[PDB]
């Protein structure tokens, strides 16, 4: 109805919008951290699988 | 004469570099590796593993078990994050059996999975 | 879920338990070596 409560809802959704824009960037940084933890476990497992496929034959 | 050696854990890396001489605790006795050694696969008990270089003749890394694999141009130590014995591993198996939360003894053949899942799948595309 | 790219997450089902002419010397019995190394391979695949 009146413009005061519309103005307060605009301020509330703007204060939600700033931190959702921040936590997108937080999710980017934790995705890159989980990518460097993804890249480190592979040369164990390829050497184990090559040793297993040699020993089974 | 130098041979490349890796000590690679299942989560990360511990060592990568050229060496000359490696002493490790094997499954029968303490053994050592030179370049040009025979191919070899052996289980390892927990302890310090000693690696020798020019100047770095006492490069010591503590390894809690795992396996060793020798190629005459390549040494691969595949290590362990924790000591693998049955008194540590059986307690983790018992804690994994005990923490299975069972609230209702369902038959498994219910239809209600898809009745929630199709509604929640159609609700997600109204947001994007 | 497998990381195809930063925009794509693909839900898969992947089998685990049913998986140069020279020979490795075996310091223990190689049967117990196979009994260890298959268990460590299943643990590395679940962790990845």
From Swiss-Prot, chain A:
Superkingdom as given in the UniProt entry: Bacteria
Subcellular location: Cell inner membrane
Function: Produces ATP from ADP in the presence of a proton gradient across the membrane. The gamma chain is believed to be important in regulating ATPase activity and the flow of protons through the CF(0) complex.
Entry similarity comment: Belongs to the ATPase gamma chain family.
Assembly mode: F-type ATPases have 2 components, CF(1) - the catalytic core - and CF(0) - the membrane proton channel. CF(1) has five subunits: alpha(3), beta(3), gamma(1), delta(1), epsilon(1). CF(0) has three main subunits: a, b and c.
Designated name of the protein: ATP synthase gamma chain
Organism of this sequence: Pseudomonas paraeruginosa (strain DSM 24068 / PA7) (Pseudomonas aeruginosa (strain PA7))
Lineage of producing organism: Bacteria, Pseudomonadati, Pseudomonadota, Gammaproteobacteria, Pseudomonadales
Gene name per UniProt: atpG
Residues of the whole record sequence present: 2 to 58 of 286
Curated annotation (Swiss-Prot), chain B:
Localization: Cell inner membrane
One GO CC term on file: proton-transporting ATP synthase complex
Gene3D superfamilies linked: ATP synthase delta/epsilon subunit, C-terminal domain, F0F1 ATP synthase delta/epsilon subunit, N-terminal
Topology class, membrane: Peripheral membrane protein
Chief localisation class: membrane
Pfam name, any one: ATP-synt_DE_N
Keywords on record: ATP synthesis, Cell inner membrane, Cell membrane, CF(1), Hydrogen ion transport, Ion transport, Membrane, Transport
GO molecular function, a single term: proton-transporting ATP synthase activity, rotational mechanism
Function per UniProt: Produces ATP from ADP in the presence of a proton gradient across the membrane.
Summary of subunit composition and partner proteins: F-type ATPases have 2 components, CF(1) - the catalytic core - and CF(0) - the membrane proton channel. CF(1) has five subunits: alpha(3), beta(3), gamma(1), delta(1), epsilon(1). CF(0) has three main subunits: a, b and c.
PANTHER family tied to this protein: ATP SYNTHASE DELTA/EPSILON CHAIN, ATP SYNTHASE EPSILON CHAIN, CHLOROPLASTIC
Family: Belongs to the ATPase epsilon chain family.
This protein's name: ATP synthase epsilon chain
């Amino acid at each position: 109805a009146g413009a005061k409560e519309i103005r307060s809802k605009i301020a509330s959704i703007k204060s939600t919008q700033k931190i959702t824009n921040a936590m997108e960037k937080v999710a980017v940084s934790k995705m890159r951290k989980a990518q460097m933890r993804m890249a480190a476990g592979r040369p164990y497992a390829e050497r184990i699988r090559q040793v297993i496929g040699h020993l089974a034959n | 004469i130098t041979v490349h050696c890796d000590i690679v854990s299942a989560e990360a890396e511990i060592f990568s570099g050229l060496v000359e001489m490696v002493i490790a605790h094997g499954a029968l006795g303490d053994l050592g590796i030179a370049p040009g050694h025979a191919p070899l696969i052996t289980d390892l008990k927990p302890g310090p593993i000693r690696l020798v270089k020019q100047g770095g003749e006492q490069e010591v890394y503590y390894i809690s078990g795992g396996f060793l694999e020798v190629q005459p141009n390549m040494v691969k130590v595949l290590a362990d994050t924790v000591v693998r014995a049955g008194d540590l591993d059986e307690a983790a198996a018992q804690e994994a059996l005990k923490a299975a939360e069972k609230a209702l003894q369902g038959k498994g053949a219910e239809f209600d999975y898809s009745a929630a899942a199709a509604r929640l799948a159609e609700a997600a595309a109204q947001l994007r | 879920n497998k990381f195809v790219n930063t925009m794509t997450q693909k839900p898969t089902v992947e089998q685990l338990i049913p998986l140069h002419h020279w020979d490795y010397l075996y310091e223990p019995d190689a049967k117990s070596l196979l009994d260890g190394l298959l268990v460590r391979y299943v643990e590395s695949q679940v962790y990845q």
